[PDB]
Each structure stands twice: as structure tokens, then as C-alpha cells.
Ligand binder design. Structure first.
Ligand code: NI
Length: 729
């Protein structure tokens, strides 16, 4: 199985390295055959002689043009004849590219900024992460001794935790004595231990959490002061640091630094991304967080280390588990795109698409256009985004169904063969003209992008077919990922067309796919109504909600499945429509804000969450009261009554005590600081909570929990009357 590829330099010439793991153990394949190169568009195949003489200077040596050969390729369908220029060393290209592009007999140059290593992959047509190869994984994390003054990495590293398929274990110097804490000498010895564990367990993947910006950088500054060789490299090298915009990224040659943060940030949606926050949001279990402030003054005093150790041990036990959750998909994304898992894992969809098209270009012999120059790059970002979500049909509805197009946006691209190499193609006998915007897209020959999309959608169909018939979960979940990557890849093309740095940028395509989207949806929203007595409830690109006023949950469903067959045999080939689900009751409030309930309970809803970190107090409880009364009970004059019935209680000082202790932390520092010369509840009326305020015969609350908690929570959901009658008099 190919893990990755990189190149070393020997005698001035580049030597490619293929890191892999075949039937059991590590192994590097070397190849010094591959040659660097890039393209050039010349005014006349004559000046090739004036050009093959141009030279540059790198490292005080001299960069020359090795060999050269003319070739024929397909630049956006249209025939092109360019010269392929070969060089001796990858770092030659970047030192002479502009010099060659600046020549007079040169109109333009192409494919001159592609990581030599990646290039090799697309040419030899090698695909990483393939075959049935089980990679050994190891998770590690570290907690250090902090101090606000500290410049950086000043304090020493207290522990190094590591989880495996065998368990977690922590390595620290001071004493603890727990079955899971390893004995070492000093800080220097600890780091040394870890190192000896890694080289020892010889893992294929090193998993960390934000270890791209913290763990490695630290371990570096510490390995320097302590005079140690951090040889995690499968070759003996030390992690190599890299640029990633405003942040950084760390490699470990021969292995795979699978940092979970960038991957988790792209997948799950949350307002806070602490490991504890994450773990919770992923497996539904609580995570105990121990803060530095506490750690510092815990490893010094004496013991509390049994606590810091646990927190440490877990940090790594959690990271490992999350590792197995998110690596599988990102690993299939790899195999689908044709690049390292290291790369794909730290990549946005636009690039995942850019790597696909670059590879597919090589196969199809299509010359790739170039990336945009700053002037243009900026110009593209200036575009206007104007979402279109028809307004919700205010009110409560029953026996609602949801229908969404099976791959809407990709279906259009295919159906209407939308692509930059078909846009404004003169001399065609056939064309499709995007609604509104009116872009002419020649249908004569299938366009590049669309051609690819078709295959992709086709195969994922193949997969889903073979996936509803296998039984063996390992042979099913296996496939399950494949078709999810394909789906992920596909829905990524629309955005890619507008992604300002896209080689295959196409604003016209994007505009078109949007306009068609509208048209198609709208045509359905209408066709279902006038011909099937449905009343479109809510709607947003992709799908929509609907029902037939007053109709058994069966009639609606029976009438539903009917419509599908109708417009389906109606609409194009790709464009198809499917039954999403059924929600016995629900109401809608503005854009992406609503709530529904299925036939077996369960309140989905996603419309208007906006929690308060903790349960806030009474709000996070009466919130449910209402919703449940609105959906399940379906009693409008009840949930609102539930408010006026509670506003006549809390203001009257009746609602329990602990049900007011706002579980928050970091006025704000009122009671907070009011305990001086980490976190703690409070039930002011500016006042702290304990057995000192509430005698149930002297102290009470305040009239805020009614206008700053209970009320503001349901005020929105409650759509019909103003809160002027939610307090009652
Ligand atoms: Ni950490």
C-alpha cells in the first residue's frame, strides 16, 4: 500500500521515494528515472531554438533546459501544440519558469507549479492507500507546564500520553504510580522514552489533535534545549514543518501525521472545538477537562498528578478513538483523489477536486490551465452571493413529507453538459441555455468536467447497488465509504466552479447550475401542487416539505410516491426525485429555522438551536416544554399558555433554586471576582450561590430569569402573539 511519496537529492539529480507497506512491513522504493518539466506555448515552433538556450541561476550554480519535445494535447477541447520542457532538478523549474514565460517566443507556460512528488504520482498513475493493508496507528498528546510570561516552549514538558490498540499509557518524570504510568528519570529521559516507544511500536500513522500547531512545535523547542534528536522519521529524520496559510503543518516521513483538528473542523459543526467538546459531540459521552492553571499548581504542590495523569491518559485514549472514526473516510477520500492521506486530510474540497481534475487531465491528455494571478484571484473573490430560500408558510402542519433531488447540482452539470470547455463553443449544432443568466452550453461533444461527473455518479450507483446486497458488514461498510467519498467529491464541483483559485474556474457554469437549480425545483413545486393537490410547506435548494391539507398519513404517502414516478419519468435522465421521509407534525420560522417530529417521537429540528453552552437553566428546560407542546401535543393554545403559567410562578418566586444557577464561566466577573483577595455556578438577584443566601424566608431571585432566560428562549418559536400576553397582565 502506498503511503506517500517524496524526493531526495543525490549528485544534483532528484530521486523519488515511494513509502509503502506491502504484505506486512514498511518499505521504500526508489526511482531515479522521473524527470521534472512543465509546458510552454510558443508563437512559432521555430523559436524553440532561441528558448532551449535560456538559463537561470539557483544556488550559485546554473539552471539550464535539459531536453525538449513538441507534443499535442487538448486545451479545453481545442487542439493545442506545445513544447514540453524537461529539467534536471525540481528546484530548477521555479528558478527559470518566469524567465521562460518572459521570453518573446512564449505566449504562456503550463503545469509548472506542481509538487514534483505529486506529479510523479499522477504520471506513473499510482494511487495511495490501496489494497487490503492494515496500518498500525498510534495516538499521542502532551500537557506542558504553562506560564503567562513564557515566550514559548519555555516551560518543560510534563507528560507524553499515548493510546494504542492495546491501551493508553502516560510517560512522566515526577511520581504517580498508576498501572498506566511509566517510570522514567528526568524530562529529557521522558521525551527519549516516547521516542523509543514510537520507533519500537513502528506505527504507520501518528494521530494528534491540533498537534500540527502545538505538540510538534513544542517537542521541537524542547528537543533543542535538551540536546536531543527527535528521530520520529521512518528514515531517521525529524518531523518536517510546513506552511499552511496562517497556520502550520507537520510531517513524519515514512509515516502519516493524521492531525484530527483540521479534519474535525471540516466535518462536525460546533461553536467550540475543544477535545472535550468534540469527544462529546461525537460519541455522546462526557469528557473531563483539567486546565493548565490547575495543572501548574498541581504538579508543584505535590499530588493532583493522579488527576493530571488521568486527564492525560484519556486525552490520548480519546484521540485514538476519534482517529479510528475519522481516518477511514479521509483514507477513502485519498484513494479516490490519488494523493497522500496527509494531504487530503488537510485539504478543502476545492483542492480535493483540483487534484482529481489534474490527474484526470494527465490520463485524458488535457493540458491543465493555470492558477489565477493575484489581480484575477482577487477579482474573483469580489463576486456576489445571493441565496434563494422562499419564505416559510407560517403555521403548524401535519402529515408532511420531504423530497430532495438525488444529486441536483451534479445532475445539471451532466444533463446540460455544463463546463468551461463547452461554454460559448462556436460552431455547434446543439446548445442548452441556462435560465435567467442565459449561458450557451454546447452539447455536441461531452465536456471535460461533466464527463468525469457522469462516471463518478455512475460508479457510486454501482456501489449503492452492490451495497444493498452483501451482508458481511466489513465488505459493506467498506463500500459504504466509497460511495460517500464519491458523493462528497461530486457535490464539490459546484463550489469548485466558483472557488477563486480553481484552475478550471467557471463563474458562468456556477451561475448556470444555480439558475437551473431554481427552475427545476420551482417546476416541481408547481407540478406537485396543481396536479397532486399538495401544498408546498417549506423549501430550500435541494428539496422541500409538503402535504395535502386534511389527509390521513396514508393518503399523503400514497399520493406522494405517485408524484415521484410522475416528474421522474418527466424530468431528464440524471435529474430524479426521491422520498426523503415523513414528519407527523412541524412548524417553520424563516430560513433554515424550523422543527419537526416523526411518527416514532423524536424531534429532529435544526432550525433554531442557539444553546447557551450549559443548559442555561430554566430556558433549556421550558424550551422543550413548549416545543413538545407544539409538536406532539399539537396544542397551540397550550405551549403559549405554558409560558403565562410559568411567568406567574417564577416572578412570584416559586420556581426551584438550582434551576437558576447559570452554569457558565471563563456582570460576568461580578460574583466571579467577588471571591478573590476556573468555573463556578451563580444565582445572583450580583450574588453567589451556596448555603448562605437562600433561607426560603429572607432571600429570593430576581425579575431577570423572566426577561433574560425563560422569555427570550421561546419568544421566536412562539409565532402568533407578542409576549405582551406571555406574562399575562
Ligand atoms: Ni493536546
Amino acid at each position: 500500500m502506498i503511503l506517500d511519496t517524496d524526493y531526495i537529492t543525490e549528485d544534483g539529480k532528484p530521486v523519488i521515494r515511494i513509502f509503502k507497506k506491502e504484505n506486512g512491513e514498511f518499505k521504500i522504493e526508489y526511482d531515479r528515472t522521473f524527470e521534472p518539466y512543465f509546458y510552454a506555448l510558443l508563437k512559432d515552433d521555430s523559436a524553440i531554438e532561441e528558448v532551449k538556450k535560456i538559463t537561470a541561476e539557483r544556488h550559485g550554480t546554473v539552471v539550464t533546459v535539459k531536453r525538449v519535445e513538441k507534443v499535442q494535447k487538448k486545451f479545453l477541447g481545442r487542439p493545442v501544440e506545445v513544447w514540453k520542457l524537461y529539467f534536471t532538478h525540481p528546484q530548477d523549474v521555479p528558478a527559470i519558469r518566469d524567465k521562460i514565460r518572459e521570453h518573446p517566443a512564449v505566449i504562456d507556460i503550463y503545469e509548472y507549479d506542481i509538487p514534483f512528488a505529486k506529479r510523479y504520482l499522477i504520471d506513473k498513475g499510482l494511487v495511495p492507500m490501496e489494497g487490503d493493508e492494515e496500518l498500525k496507528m498510534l495516538a499521542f498528546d502532551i500537557e506542558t507546564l504553562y506560564e503567562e510570561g513564557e515566550e514559548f516552549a519555555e516551560g518543560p514538558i510534563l507528560m507524553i500520553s499515548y493510546a494504542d490498540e492495546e491501551g493508553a499509557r502516560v510517560i512522566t518524570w515526577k511520581n504517580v504510580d498508576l498501572p498506566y504510568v511509566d517510570v522514567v528519570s528526568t524530562e529529557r529521559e521522558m521525551i527519549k522514552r516516547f521516542l523509543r516507544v514510537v520507533k519500537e511500536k513502528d506505527p504507520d500513522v501518528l494521530i494528534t489533535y491540533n498537534g500540527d500547531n502545538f505538540d510538534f512545535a513544542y517537542l521541537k523547542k524542547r528537543c533543542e534545549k535538551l540536546g536531543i534528536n527527535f528521530a520520529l522519521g521512518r528514515d531517521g529524520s525529524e518531523p518536517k514543518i510546513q506552511r499552511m496559510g496562517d497556520r502550520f503543518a507537520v510531517e513524519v516521513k515514512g509515516r502519516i501525521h493524521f492531525d484530527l483538528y483540521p479534519v474535525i473542523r471540516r466535518t462536525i459543526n460546533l461553536p467550540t472545538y475543544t477535545l472535550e467538546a468534540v469527544y462529546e459531540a461525537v460519541f455522546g459521552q462526557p469528557k473531563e477537562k483539567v486546565y493548565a492553571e490547575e495543572i501548574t499548581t498541581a504538579w508543584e504542590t505535590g499530588e493532583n498528578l493522579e488527576r493530571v495523569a488521568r486527564y492525560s491518559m484519556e486525552d490520548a485514549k480519546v484521540t485514538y478513538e476519534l482517529g479510528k472514526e475519522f481516518l477511514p473516510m479521509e483514507a477513502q477520500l485519498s484513494r479516490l483523489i490519488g494523493q497522500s492521506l496527509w494531504d487530503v486530510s488537510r485539504s478543502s474540497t476545492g483542492n480535493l477536486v483540483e487534484w482529481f481534475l489534474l490527474r484526470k487531465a494527465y490520463e485524458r491528455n488535457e493540458l491543465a490551465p493555470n492558477k489565477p494571478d493575484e489581480k484575477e484571484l482577487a477579482r474573483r473573490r469580489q463576486s456576489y452571493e445571493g441565496g434563494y430560500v422562499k419564505e416559510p408558510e407560517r403555521g403548524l402542519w401535519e402529515n408532511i413529507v420531504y423530497l430532495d433531488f438525488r444529486s441536483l447540482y451534479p445532475s445539471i452539470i451532466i444533463t446540460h453538459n455544463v463546463s468551461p470547455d463547452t461554454l460559448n463553443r462556436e460552431g455547434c449544432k446543439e446548445y442548452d441555455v441556462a435560465p435567467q443568466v442565459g449561458h450557451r452550453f454546447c452539447k455536441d461533444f461531452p465536456g471535460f468536467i461533466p464527463s468525469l461527473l457522469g462516471d463518478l455518479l455512475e460508479e457510486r450507483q454501482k456501489i449503492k447497488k452492490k451495497m444493498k446486497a452483501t451482508i458481511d458488514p466489513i465488505e459493506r461498510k467498506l463500500l459504504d465509504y466509497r460511495q460517500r467519498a464519491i458523493k462528497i467529491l461530486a457535490n464539490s464541483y459546484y463550489g469548485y466552479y466558483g472557488y477563486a483559485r480553481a484552475r478550471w474556474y467557471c463563474k458562468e457554469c456556477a451561475e448556470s447550475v444555480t439558475a437551473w437549480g431554481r427552475e427545476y425545483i420551482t417546476m416541481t413545486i408547481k407540478e406537485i401542487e396543481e396536479k397532486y393537490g399538495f401544498k408546498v410547506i417549506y423549501s430550500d435548494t435541494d428539496g422541500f416539505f409538503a402535504t395535502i391539507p386534511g389527509a390521513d398519513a396514508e393518503t399523503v404517502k400514497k399520493k406522494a410516491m405517485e408524484f415521484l414516478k410522475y416528474i421522474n419519468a418527466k424530468l431528464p435522465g440524471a435529474l430524479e426525485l426521491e422520498y426523503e421521509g415523513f414528519y407527523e407534525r412541524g412548524f417553520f420560522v424563516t430560513k433554515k429555522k424550523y422543527a419537526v417530529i416523526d411518527e416514532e417521537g423524536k424531534i429532529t429540528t435544526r432550525g433554531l438551536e442557539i444553546v447557551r453552552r450549559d443548559w442555561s437553566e430554566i430556558a433549556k428546560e421550558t424550551q422543550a416544554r413548549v416545543l413538545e407542546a407544539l409538536l406532539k401535543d399539537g396544542d397551540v393554545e397550550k405551549a403559549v399558555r405554558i409560558v403565562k403559567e410559568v411567568t406567574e410562578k417564577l416572578s412570584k418566586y416559586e420556581v426551584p433554586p438550582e434551576k437558576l444557577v447559570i452554569h457558565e464561566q471563563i456582570p460576568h466577573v461580578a460574583v466571579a471576582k467577588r471571591l478573590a483577595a476556573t468555573v463556578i455556578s451563580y444565582i445572583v438577584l450580583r450574588a453567589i450561590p451556596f448555603d448562605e443566601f437562600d433561607p426560603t424566608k429572607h432571600k429570593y431571585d430576581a425579575e431577570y430569569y423572566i426577561e433574560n432566560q425563560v422569555l427570550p428562549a421561546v419568544e421566536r418559536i412562539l409565532r402568533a402573539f407578542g409576549y405582551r400576553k406571555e406574562d399575562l397582565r
